[PDB]
Amino acid sequence: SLPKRIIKETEKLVSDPVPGITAEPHDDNLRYFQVTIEGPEQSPYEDGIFELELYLPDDYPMEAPKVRFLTKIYHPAIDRLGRISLDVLKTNWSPALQIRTVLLSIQALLASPNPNNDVAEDWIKNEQGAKAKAREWTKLYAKKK
């Protein structure tokens, strides 16, 4: 028996899903989610599916979900380790936000790859080549949709 907060969030993911995103909790541990996010059209990731794992810590919703990007990807906000650069996961977190919020943010991150890190270096110096590399990696590493 989890906090009803978590049960309520889980039910809403099944009944009112977000187009292009899937989120499946695991029977053996309902705090652990397998997540797929489709590459947004008109972005360098258009053709690909991306895997993520997500975990709800004990202090949730006071504490942010832990997230790790699993698919290999060329992106200025996702490192080699799969750590994601989102303030909503750092300082901006509050119990008013949800899993949905985190997922919509990561989807938005793929939609609009913006720098401001050495991949972000490449995106500011000769960017049209970086966007081209991201598309190549999508073909190589991101499972076909």
UniProtKB/Swiss-Prot annotation:
Single biological process term from Gene Ontology: protein targeting to vacuolar membrane
Keywords per UniProt: ATP-binding, Isopeptide bond, Nucleotide-binding, Transferase, Ubl conjugation, Ubl conjugation pathway
Domain UBC core: 1-143
PROSITE patterns attached to this UniProt entry: UBC_1, UBC_2
GO cellular component, one term: fungal-type vacuole membrane
Annotated metabolic or biological route of this protein: Protein modification; protein ubiquitination
Family of the protein in this entry: Belongs to the ubiquitin-conjugating enzyme family.
Record-given protein name: Ubiquitin-conjugating enzyme E2 13
This protein's encoding gene: UBC13
